[PDB]
């Protein structure tokens, strides 16, 4: 068979709704396993400075006590069932989910009602986690990469709630109350701004009954002025630097304003990042690689690792890169990086486009090799774009992309803009913001 | 769709499973791990694990690295003390290219003199990234202490060996271990006659290894880290034997690893047993390793300096209780639900699936579907689960540890 034939043969996802507001969807497939979760709209961007870090602090107590399954009972009905259980927060979204088998599913979904709705939040545990949190802020100091983005988001989105961390400052965590949790919990966990999804071994109507069974009692409404909408988070062009000469290496990042989720040119930008790409000190390609940014850094050994990205938030995002290099080589890398963007905004060879197009296809696909990646993409799609996108729709959008579009897109979002810069380490050579911007436009 | 599975006169397995997926995928599982490295040619597989992307006869090191990236595929090399996979990926519209790149790696590597020279000091980085994760020189010394001849050969290469590897010391290896009698041109997302074509045209070509003679021994690494790591094992059995499936369930009986994110691991008999008396950080779990000739079983430690003995003497005492009959049935049938899951969940992804379709094909010669395994988990005996631990306790012991070792005991003090 062929490619275009393949995406047609893919299971077309299914959708449903409940009277309270809880969207539901799923995707049938022949995998005996499955995985189910609750991908919602709640995090630090909604926190204010007084309840900051809440969206993470809840995440430890949900699996540590309820009303109908207190103590380690909830933790015992999974292990005894033989499934995995998992969660993760963000700055906007949030998610709890399970990896379990098909036949044991009707028990899984029962629990999430006992978790999302009926978390008991006993005080003896609240004090323990209040110490555990202050153990991981110590750890993430060592997760030097994540320190950078926490600095990056903190600058370009200064003044907004979005500059906040996820776990919150150490101060608020030593001041947070049950009521703030109760008040935070009692507002965001609401059916219209929630989702359920799963795939693997199930049918969509094995499931719709079960949320009609368990989640039907959820608070599908609110006091008329209680559920806020968003503020447009502006963008700043600003630099931040945590000068530290004593450490081995310097983690660095730069980025600009992103367009947002809905804006279709994200399909353009993911190509451009793919054109640039990534490298970390182990790929056997070396000089013979294709991305000039890689072959140089392999040739001249300027750096040890770097990666691009594309973060996308409500009506904006972040586009840029992160790189790690010895102190005597920062300024050299930045010239090359900036050299490529100007090259792409100006002279994007068609032969180099088909690479990134063909690179991107083998991301989204290979990303969706399993159930858990699928069920992320579902539960994330139903709060970002709305509809999930069948992959033969992405493909058509991509084949529209030619070298004419890139030169327009990158002109709009790179050229002459007001970037945001971050630095953590021996950055004695890190050039000033003005020199960065002057290096932003060719000629 | 169902799984073809065949065999040539040369002993070359094939497979194929045309799932009508967009993303094609291939694997070529081969028996060339570190075990077949004798005393002279140590660390050669480590180099050969990087030797991908190098020159061939059908194309250069350059053409490969560009043709692949154009279509958008990959070229990964998973490798073990037994096996040496050359996995890839692609879009199925462009398989006929990437196949040609592949077999030119294996069937026609030149291994020129100079490209090696650039490639050696890469090892000092590769070897170094791993040991940021301290397990993989704890775990290596086990095979170094426990076993003697073949499986003791670490995946990675000793330091002094770098700078000194010879190309002839690859040609001799390739011409002795990349042999059509012990290979497996697995496929996926792709049809069967296609692979049957290519193998008969390029792989239609023609050493052995000694057995893992267990010894029993202990190695120590006082290396200034703030924590402790330690592993304590005993002779297991190989795979295929139903004696295996008693260990692999006894794993989850005893310590499985966290199934709940940030969980207290309540049902783990071992971790729970530590939680009384101990009131400081720790973590601990079972270690099961099942190679074709032999294996190991035991557990792995994480603790502070002073509290190494006070943790290990929970594990050892606990497992004795598991050997002295003190046990229940629901723990097992609960533990099986874990084992029956991780197998399926592992083969959820095409890759993790692909890791198992062929790993059987080399040691065994037939693909066992998941269902037939789950029977073998149901037919397990609670007199094998016990034995099992009786073999562990009564059995000779191998051990290793890393960190601060001022309060860490030997075997005999247990």
């Amino acid at each position: 068979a062929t490619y275009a034939q393949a995406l047609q043969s893919v299971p077309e996802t299914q959708v449903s709704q409940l009277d309270n507001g809880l969207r539901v969807a799923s995707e049938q497939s022949s995998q005996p396993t499955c995985t189910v979760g609750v991908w919602i709209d709640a995090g630090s961007r909604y926190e204010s400075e007084k309840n900051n870090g809440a969206g993470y602090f809840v995440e430890h107590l949900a699996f540590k006590g309820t009303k109908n399954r207190p103590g380690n009972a909830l933790e015992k009905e999974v292990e005894s069932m033989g499934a995995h259980l998992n969660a993760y927060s963000t700055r906007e979204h949030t998610a709890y989910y399970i990896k379990a088998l098909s036949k044991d599913l009707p028990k899984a979904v029962e629990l999430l009602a006992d978790i999302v709705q009926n978390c008991s939040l006993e005080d003896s545990q609240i004090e323990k986690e209040r110490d555990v949190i202050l153990q991981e802020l110590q750890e993430n100091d060592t997760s030097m990469r994540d320190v950078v983005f926490n600095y990056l988001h903190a600058t370009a989105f200064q003044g907004t709630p979005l500059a906040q961390s996820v776990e919150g400052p150490s101060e608020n965590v030593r001041k947070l109350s049950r009521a703030d949790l109760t008040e935070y919990l009692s507002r965001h966990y609401k059916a219209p701004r929630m989702v359920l999804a799963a795939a693997g071994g199930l049918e969509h109507r094995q499931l719709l009954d079960l949320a009609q069974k368990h989640f039907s009692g959820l608070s599908g409404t609110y006091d008329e002025d209680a559920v806020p909408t968003l503020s447009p988070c502006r963008f700043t062009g600003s630099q931040i630097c945590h000068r530290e000469d004593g450490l081995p290496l310097a983690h660095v990042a730069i980025a600009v304003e992103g367009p947002g989720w809905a804006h279709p040119d994200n399909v353009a930008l993911q190509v451009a990042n793919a054109i640039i790409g990534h490298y970390d000190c182990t790929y056997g390609g070396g000089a013979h690689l294709s991305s000039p940014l890689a072959s140089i850094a392999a040739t001249n050994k300027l750096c040890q690792s770097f990666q691009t990205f594309n973060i996308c938030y409500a009506d904006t995002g972040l586009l840029g890169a992160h790189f790690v290099c010895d102190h005597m080589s920062i300024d050299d890398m930045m010239f090359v990086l900036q050299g490529q963007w100007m090259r792409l905004c100006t002279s994007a060879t068609e032969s180099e486009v088909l690479r990134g197009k063909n690179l991107l296809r083998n991301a989204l696909v290979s990303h969706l090799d399993g159930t858990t990646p699928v069920c992320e993409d579902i539960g994330r799609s139903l709060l970002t774009y709305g509809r999930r996108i069948p992959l033969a729709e992405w493909e058509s959008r991509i084949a529209e992309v030619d070298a004419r579009v890139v030169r327009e897109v990158c002109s709009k979002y790179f050229y002459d803009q007001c970037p945001a810069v971050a630095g953590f380490g021996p950055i004695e050579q890190l050039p000033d913001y003005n020199r960065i911007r002057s290096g932003m436009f060719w000629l | 769709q169902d799984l073809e599975f065949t065999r040539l006169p040369n002993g070359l397995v094939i497979a194929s499973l045309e799932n009508y997926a967009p993303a094609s995928r291939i694997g070529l599982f081969i028996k060339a791990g570190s075990r077949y490295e004798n005393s002279n040619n140590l660390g050669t597989s480590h180099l050969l694990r990087l030797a991908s992307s190098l020159t061939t006869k059908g194309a250069s090191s350059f053409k490969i690295t560009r043709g692949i990236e154009a279509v958008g595929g990959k070229l990964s090399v998973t490798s073990t003390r037994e096996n040496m996979a050359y996995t890839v990926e692609c879009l199925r519209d462009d398989v006929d290219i990437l196949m040609e790149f592949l077999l030119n790696v294996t069937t026609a590597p030149e291994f020129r003199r100079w490209e090696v020279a650039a490639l050696q000091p890469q090892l000092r980085i590769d070897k170094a990234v791993a040991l940021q994760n301290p397990q993989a020189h704890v775990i290596e010394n086990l095979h170094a202490a426990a076993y003697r001849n073949a499986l003791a050969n670490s995946l990675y290469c000793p330091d002094y060996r770098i700078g000194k590897v010879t190309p002839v010391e690859l040609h001799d290896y390739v011409q002795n271990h990349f042999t059509s009698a012990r290979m497996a041109l697995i496929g996926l997302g792709v049809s069967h006659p296609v692979l049957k074509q290519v193998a008969e045209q390029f792989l239609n070509i023609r050493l052995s290894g000694a057995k893992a003679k267990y010894h029993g021994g202990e190695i120590r690494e006082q290396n200034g880290d703030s924590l402790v790591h330690a592993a304590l094992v005993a002779e297991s059995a190989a795979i295929g034997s139903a004696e295996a499936n008693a260990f692999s369930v006894l794993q989850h009986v005893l310590g499985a690893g966290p199934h709940v994110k940030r969980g207290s691991n309540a049902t783990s008999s071992l971790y729970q047993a530590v939680a009384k008396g101990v009131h400081e950080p720790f973590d601990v779990s079972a270690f099961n390793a099942s190679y074709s000739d032999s294996g190991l079983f035991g557990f792995y430690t994480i603790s502070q300096a002073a509290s190494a003995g006070d943790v290990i003497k929970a594990a050892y005492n606990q497992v004795k209780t598991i050997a002295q009959g003190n046990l229940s049935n629901p723990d097992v049938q609960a533990a099986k639900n874990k084992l029956k899951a991780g197998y399926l969940m592992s083969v959820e992804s095409s890759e993790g699936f692909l890791d198992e379709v062929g790993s059987q094909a080399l040691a065994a010669g037939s693909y066992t579907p998941p269902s037939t395994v789950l029977q073998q988990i149901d037919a397990v005996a609670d007199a094998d689960v016990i034995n099992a631990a009786k073999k562990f306790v009564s059995g000779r012991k191998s051990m290793a540890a890393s960190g601060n070792l001022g309060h860490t005991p030997f075997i005999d003090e247990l």
Partner: peptide, 17 residues
């Protein structure tokens, strides 16, 4: 855990367990 090696041409080199 039964550690396994992995390098590549484009996947970051890693240590499965």
């Amino acid at each position: 855990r039964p550690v396994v090696a992995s390098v590549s041409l484009n996947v970051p080199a890693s240590v499965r367990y």
